[PDB]
Amino acid sequence: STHGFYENYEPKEILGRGVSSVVRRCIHKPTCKEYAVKIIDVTGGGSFSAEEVQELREATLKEVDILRKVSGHPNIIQLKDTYETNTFFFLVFDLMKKGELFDYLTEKVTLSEKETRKIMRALLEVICALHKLNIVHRDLKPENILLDDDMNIKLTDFGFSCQLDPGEKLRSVCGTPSYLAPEIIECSMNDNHPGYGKEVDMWSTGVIMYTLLAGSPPFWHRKQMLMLRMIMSGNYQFGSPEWDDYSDTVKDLVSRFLVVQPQKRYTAEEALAHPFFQQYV
Ligand SMILES: Nc1ncnc2c1ncn2[C@@H]1O[C@H](COP(=O)(O)OP(=O)(O)OP(=O)(O)O)[C@@H](O)[C@H]1O
Ligand SMILES: [Mn+2]
Ligand SMILES: [Mn+2]
C-alpha cells in the first residue's frame, strides 16, 4: 500500500499536522491532478504501546467509515482514496486551496455580519445533514472548516465523529476545551451523568459563530479549570467595543446556541429558521 501510495502519487509540501498526522499536497501521477493526503502514523513514530496502536487503527477505520457515510455533500470534504500499511494510513482528499477558516479569521481579525451569515448558513446546512444521519462531529472548530477556490467552506476532520444508535449517549471527553459543551465537562466529573448527544455540536457552532464576529472566543481563562467553570455556568457577554457594531438579531441567535442545558439549546434546524436567515423568504 506504501508502494501503492507512492506508486500513484508524488508527495509535495506540508499543509498541516495533528498529533499523529501530517497532511500533504500530492500529485496523482496518472491524472496530474492535485489532492491532499492525510498521513496517519498508527504506531505513533515508534512510541505508543501495542494497545494504543490498535486504538489508533480502529480510530482511523472509524474515521474512513464516517467519511464514506457523508460523501457527496457539497460542503463536506470528499474522501477519494485510502491505502493502509502496517504503520501508516493514507487518506486522499480533494485539495482545499484557501486553507482554514482559522487562517482566514487570523488575517481578517473579525468577519462582518453578512460574511458570518454566509458561512454559518453553509455550516448549519452541513450539521443538519449530519444530525439526520445521527452523526455527531464532536470537533467543530475553525481549523476543521476549510476553504475551496471560491471561498465556500468544506467541513473536514471527522477523526472524533460517530454515528449514534437511537437514544445513545457518549461519555468520553475529546475536542478542544474552549469549544467543549458543558454537558461534556459535567459528564467528565460525574459517573452517574447521562452522557451527551448531538447537541454538543450546537454548542461548538455557538463558539464558532461568536468567535468569527468578535475575533476571540466567548470562554477563556489562562487557568483551564476556571475557564471550564465559565463554560459550565454559561458566563459570557456581548461586550466592550467588540459587539457594538452588530444587530440584536445576530446576538439573539448566538445566545441560543450558547445555552447550558442541551434540551433547551437550538438545534441546526431551529438555527436555520431564526429570523437572522429569513431576509429573502
Ligand atoms: N483537504 C485538505 N485540503 C487542504 N488542507 C488540508 C486538507 N485536509 C487537511 N488540511 C490541513 O491539515 C490540517 C490537519 O488536518 P486534520 O484536521 O484533518 O488533521 P488532524 O490530525 O485530525 O487534526 P487535529 O489535531 O485537529 O485532530 C487542517 O487543519 C488543514 O490545515
Ligand atoms: Mn483538525
Ligand atoms: Mn482530528
Side-chain angles (χ1 to χ4, degrees), residues 254-267:
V254 174
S255 85
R256 315 236 172 198
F257 290 125
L258 295 192
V259 183
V260 165
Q261 290 218 59
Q263 314 88 19
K264 311 230 229 66
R265 198 175 307 139
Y266 250 31
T267 45

Side-chain angles (χ1 to χ4, degrees), residues 86-222:
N86 234 88
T87 45
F88 295 106
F89 283 83
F90 291 81
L91 328 180
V92 181
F93 297 92
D94 284 325
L95 179 70
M96 292 288 113
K97 301 198 204 252
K98 305 304 212 162
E100 309 180 13
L101 179 60
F102 181 74
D103 302 320
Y104 183 65
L105 175 72
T106 288
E107 185 166 322
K108 299 265 284 201
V109 202
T110 72
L111 304 183
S112 75
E113 179 158 2
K114 312 197 181 179
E115 201 168 16
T116 297
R117 188 168 51 233
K118 197 211 204 214
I119 300 194
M120 295 311 297
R121 169 188 319 264
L123 173 63
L124 284 167
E125 286 161 3
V126 159
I127 300 173
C128 224
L130 290 172
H131 286 185
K132 311 202 167 168
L133 292 168
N134 233 35
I135 288 173
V136 61
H137 189 284
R138 275 188 299 196
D139 208 6
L140 291 175
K141 70 183 155 206
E143 300 103 314
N144 292 344
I145 293 161
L146 306 196
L147 294 159
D148 67 33
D149 281 41
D150 319 336
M151 297 299 284
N152 305 327
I153 59 156
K154 204 64 99 193
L155 191 57
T156 192
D157 199 3
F158 288 75
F160 300 162
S161 306
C162 37
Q163 193 148 46
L164 308 162
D165 301 323
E168 165 189 22
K169 295 314 167 177
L170 309 144
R171 287 185 137 286
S172 60
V173 170
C174 51
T176 308
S178 53
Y179 299 83
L180 292 172
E183 59 272 31
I184 299 181
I185 303 157
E186 279 296 346
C187 194
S188 78
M189 283 148 64
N190 175 14
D191 172 79
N192 299 137
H193 194 272
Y196 57 87
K198 277 182 299 176
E199 306 84 4
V200 302
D201 286 340
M202 307 313 295
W203 179 266
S204 273
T205 299
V207 179
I208 288 172
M209 164 154 172
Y210 188 106
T211 305
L212 312 178
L213 296 147
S216 77
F219 303 89
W220 195 274
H221 202 347
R222 303 281 168 110

